[PDB]
């Protein structure tokens, strides 16, 4: 039971990195902005700083508080 849970979650982890890797390779090799003008892909690219900054907030918030609470308890 332990082996099968571990096996499948490690495989899922590697596979989810790949999906994002091949997403980057699409944006470099196959995305053309002229053809995709005004649709959701170009829009998502046009507010990329909002996305990254908001994720940066969530990350900093969880990290601070969660490591905090563990260190308090220790």
């Amino acid at each position: 039971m332990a082996a099968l849970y571990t096996h499948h979650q490690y495989i899922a982890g590697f596979i989810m990195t790949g999906a994002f890797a091949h997403g980057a390779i699409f944006f470099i090799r196959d995305f053309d902005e002229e053809k995709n003008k005004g649709n959701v892909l170009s829009r998502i690219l046009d507010h990329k700083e909002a996305i990254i900054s908001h994720l940066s907030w969530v990350t900093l918030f969880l990290g601070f508080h969660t490591l905090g609470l563990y260190v308090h308890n220790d």
Partner: protein
Amino acid sequence: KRVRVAFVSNPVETSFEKWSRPGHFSRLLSKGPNTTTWIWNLHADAHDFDNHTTDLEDISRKVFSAHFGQLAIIEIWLSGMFFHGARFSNYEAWLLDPIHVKPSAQIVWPIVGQEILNGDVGGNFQGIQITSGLFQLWRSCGITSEFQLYITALTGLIFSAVLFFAGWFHYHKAAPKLEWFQNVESMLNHHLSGLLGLGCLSWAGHQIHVSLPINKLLDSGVNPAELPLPHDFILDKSLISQLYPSFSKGLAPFFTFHWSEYSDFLTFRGGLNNVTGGLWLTDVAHHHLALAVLFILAGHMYKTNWKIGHDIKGLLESHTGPFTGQGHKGLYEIFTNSWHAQLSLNLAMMGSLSIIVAQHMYSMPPYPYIAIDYGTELSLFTHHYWIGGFCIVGAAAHAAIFMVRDYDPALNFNNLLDRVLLHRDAIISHLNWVCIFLGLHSFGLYIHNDTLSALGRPQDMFSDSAIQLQPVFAQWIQNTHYLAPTLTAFNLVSPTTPVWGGDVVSISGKVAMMPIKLGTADFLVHHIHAFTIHVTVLILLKGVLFSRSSRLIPDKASLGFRFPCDGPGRGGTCQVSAWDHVFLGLFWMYNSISVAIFHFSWKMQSDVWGTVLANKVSHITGGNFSQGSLTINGWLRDFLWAQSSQVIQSYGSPLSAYGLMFLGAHFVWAFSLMFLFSGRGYWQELIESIVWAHNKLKVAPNIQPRALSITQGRAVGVAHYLLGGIATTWSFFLARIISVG
């Protein structure tokens, strides 16, 4: 005449103006910040005096004055230790019962529950057990009161002020000229005869007149309250005559060269006192007095002002053989014009001295009752080993700074330094082979044992019960040192230490010292040590010899001592600088010292430290080093896993601070990998998105956020790695040896 004080009056005005202008010392930094990089550059460049000015006189002056500031901070630190010892310690209690009371000189305030750290250490006292050896050192000096500790701490604070004064004076008011600083023969004569010579004479004087009586009385159980005060030994000669009758003859034997009359306080017994487990103080007195004589003599060797004495430049130029070209010519100019060259040599020696101190102070315990304080013994060994490793790596740094900044080809044509640089591919390549050979034939033996053990073939292992590898030379040396008192050191009674052989010295039940025997396990660890030191030399020496050029980069010197790379071409040139060699050598020095202190801790706990019942000695880990250390699994299991029980079971006790420091250090170590494994390209692009959100809410800063530099990332990485590693071992060592022993 020639050697003379020469100076300049009032060369720099004392004002708080420049204190309010950060970066003043640099042409670039003084324009003010525009990015955050400036802030870091301000701290990184502050003590780099040879980048502020070009004048060697101005540099010498800054160096001399900074030295006084260092002495002032050291004096504050010592005064603190004496004060904490006088006002928050159980030193007077410990002086009555050294064996049972544990030394303690740090109390904690009650707040947020931290008072649990004030443990039960004895002497009607609660506090933190200290492992620095202060109490034993004080006892050896003859200090018995808190008043004496208080006086010392006040005098030291005044003395610290005076040294801060001297620094201001000798920089701002009366600054010596470069000619003064360049009197290296005067400096050597004074530092040998004066600082070390008279220093030893003075301290032998203190020993003979204060430390020897007071210790002699104390070792015969005389209760420190009813001890005479130290002057009483000077004023009343009858007191000191009862203890050492030779004093009744006064100084007449000295002047008539009948020195053998002083053979009751100036001995040559050898070995440890049977009461305290330390060296005999009468030996220590003879030692310091003999040193005095040799140092005063030695400082009479260089020529200053009187037509006698050796000229160093001559002496160096005289020694030149056939293999070596022009030989030692040109070195005198290097050692009297380059501060970085001197700092290199002096750090290499200071580092090597710290390691020798460590090895000599465990085997020949010099203070009363320090050998049966196992926490002290472990702490001092480990401390001095780390200090040594750091200094040696500094020596390599400053040597490379000398090659990049102060090497002149013109003045080094076909001397030793030039010839070294003409065969630097032969030096590095031979070092490379030796390192591979020692790697395979030493760590390969552990991998052998681990594998054959796991395959169920223990008779195929390198072991004392199997294929033996005996360290036969060291055994030979041990035997010779044990027999020495019978022929080759005839006038000595006992050998220098029990380590060489003989009987167990045991104070109360506890073992002070006992013979340390060597076999297969000792052979493998020793060759592991020889391997890790050789690799560290390989990384540091490569950095010094290839600091100016290499086949890859012909003009490295023009790029400098500290530069991140020369770009992604030629296959990629990351970390070619000499600074980057010091950075990688820090990790290998960490690996080397770490293995040595693990060796010590396991060997001492398994084969020396313990308790004696009649004649049977019950060691702390019951002799598991000889068999258990022959595999990696045994190091992990019988050392790392087993001896880590004390630190991980320390919560809720007065040792819980070690538990927290153990986890905290694991954290800081892992945090270091974020800096070591990444690069600033990623971070600068992530900071661009963060700067976006600040910009959108109109709260972006005028000093523009920049990711750290390449060099600084590497520096942060190795700093947090070294801190987290060393503190982890510190927690683990102190919690273990404070509990069990």
